[PDB]
């Protein structure tokens, strides 16, 4: 069969339609008209967006398809070298530094990373225990502050401190005009235009900036020999049993930027759109409070009362189900190959697995795919393979998923346990696009349900 595709525009293609502040939510729309899959092309480059699990179920088969790292990555390449988000499956150094990490971040590491979590949350908690009357909360802004701080504890026992501050420590700063950088990057007619002297300039000294302090950090835990409960403690104790080597310095370096600026958004905009959720359904709001206050029966939680909040990680799902924070991926075909009995790619050929519209296929969730319920997520193994995928594919899925998601599940669980929330603006949902997808300009007030930590 021959694949649909959006409008052209003579000889830039189809390029123009990403040429918007928000083109996932425009490949949502172009995906809502043409169907499960259509061909997007523009000058010297091709790729196939899908959008249905029928498809997706087959993208998903790893001895098909591998990761291709598309134009986003390849520029946040620049700053996060040869980490495990930004590494081809064949570099020697992603096959290294996966078999090294992934046991440092199962669900069972996560016991290790609790307490330094709830130190961070903790800082949320009495920040709007101490608002006046007057006062709302930002919800993004704050939720960005807990995920950057609890990543730089968990990831190298540095304190950002961003509690403390209106500007970011130096680093988040750098981190984040580099994140733009690299996505401002993909919408430039001309990148050697003068125009651009002084991004270009900005971008090295960011780069430098990041590379100087998480280099000194290494240094510094190197000489003096500390063991922590971090990833940085773990990076430098690790062997691979493959190949019996560690991670060399500038690896480790690499992939601490990456576990920031890779890890720290998805993992704020989840916390964003869950509030945002439950704020919007007031009956499923107390039905996560109720269960906060069932389950968080001490001052502070522990690993094992997160593990028992079930329908607060319901709601986290299916806040994940509708906003995917992390919205795309890209596969590369390893052989000829055709897909869905109808479509043949040749070796090299691009897919894209647009996920916010993977998890509206009505085949799979039923017809009222833009309601907010929970209660999907009952018993989330009634889910088909390749159906709900949020955290990626195969070996080459989130490794932060599980502190993701106890994260998300420890600072929700105590947002809901300690106050009332009011949606005082009723706020319009407004979804900025930047590597990640968040609610921009999302407020609400907090009432203070007076129980100690
Ligand atoms: C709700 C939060 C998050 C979501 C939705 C998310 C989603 C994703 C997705 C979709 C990918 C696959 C990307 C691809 O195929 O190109 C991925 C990879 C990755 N994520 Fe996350 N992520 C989240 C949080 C985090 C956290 C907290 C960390 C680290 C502290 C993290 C670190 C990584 C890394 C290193 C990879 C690359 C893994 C590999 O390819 O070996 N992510 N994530
Ligand atoms: N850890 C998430 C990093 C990330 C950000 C945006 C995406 O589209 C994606 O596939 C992965």
Redesign the pocket.
């Known amino acids: 069969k021959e694949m649909p595709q959006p409008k052209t525009f003579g000889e830039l293609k189809n390029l123009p339609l990403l040429n918007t502040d928000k083109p996932v939510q425009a490949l949502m729309k172009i995906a809502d008209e043409l169907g499960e899959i259509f061909k997007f092309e523009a000058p010297g480059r091709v790729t196939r967006y899908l959008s249905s699990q029928r498809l997706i179920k087959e993208a998903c088969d790893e001895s098909r398809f591998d ?1 291709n790292l598309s134009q986003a ?1 390849k520029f946040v390449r620049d700053f996060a070298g040869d ?3 930004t590494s081809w499956t064949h570099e020697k150094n ?1 096959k290294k530094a ?1 078999n090294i990490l992934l046991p440092s971040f199962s669900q069972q590491a996560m016991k290790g990373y609790h307490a330094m979590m709830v130190d961070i949350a903790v800082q949320l908690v009495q920040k709007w225990e101490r608002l006046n009357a007057d006062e709302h909360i930002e919800v993004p802004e704050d939720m960005t502050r807990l995920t950057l701080d609890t ?1 730089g504890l968990c ?1 190298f026992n540095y304190r950002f401190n961003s509690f403390y501050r209106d500007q970011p420590h130096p680093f988040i700063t750098s981190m984040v005009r580099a994140l733009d950088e690299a996505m401002n990057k993909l919408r430039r007619a001309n990148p050697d235009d003068p125009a651009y002297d002084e991004n270009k300039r900005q971008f090295q000294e960011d780069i430098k900036v990041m590379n100087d302090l998480v280099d000194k950090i290494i240094a510094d835990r190197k000489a003096s020999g500390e063991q922590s409960d971090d990833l940085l403690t773990h990076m430098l104790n690790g062997k691979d049993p493959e190949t019996g080597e560690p991670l060399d310095d500038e690896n480790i370096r690499y992939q601490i930027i ?2 920031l600026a ?2 720290h958004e ?2 704020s905009g ?1 916390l964003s759109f869950a509030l945002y959720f439950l704020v919007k359904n007031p009956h499923e709001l107390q039905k996560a409070a109720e269960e906060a206050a069932r389950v968080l029966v001490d001052p502070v939680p522990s690993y094992k009362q997160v593990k028992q909040l079930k329908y607060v990680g319901m709601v986290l799902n299916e806040a ?1 189900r509708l906003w ?3 919205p795309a ?2 596969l590369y075909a390893k052989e000829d190959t055709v897909l869905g009995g109808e479509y043949p790619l040749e070796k090299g050929d691009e897919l894209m697995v647009l996920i916010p519209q993977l998890h509206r296929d009505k085949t799979i969730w039923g017809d009222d795919v833009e309601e907010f319920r929970p209660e999907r997520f009952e018993n989330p193994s009634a889910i088909p393979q390749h159906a709900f995928k ?4 195969g070996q ?6 599980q ?2 998601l106890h994260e ?1 599940t420890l600072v929700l669980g105590m947002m809901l346990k300690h106050f009332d929330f009011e949606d005082h603006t009723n706020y319009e949902l407004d979804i900025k696009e930047t590597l990640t997808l968040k609610p921009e300009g999302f407020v609400v007030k907090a009432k203070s349900k007076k129980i100690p930590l």
């Open positions: 990761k990555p980490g495990l988000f992603w996966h990543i990831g990456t576990f890779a890890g998805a993992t989840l994940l995917p924070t992390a991926f890209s949020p955290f990626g594919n080459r899925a989130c490794i932060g998923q502190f993701a998300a």
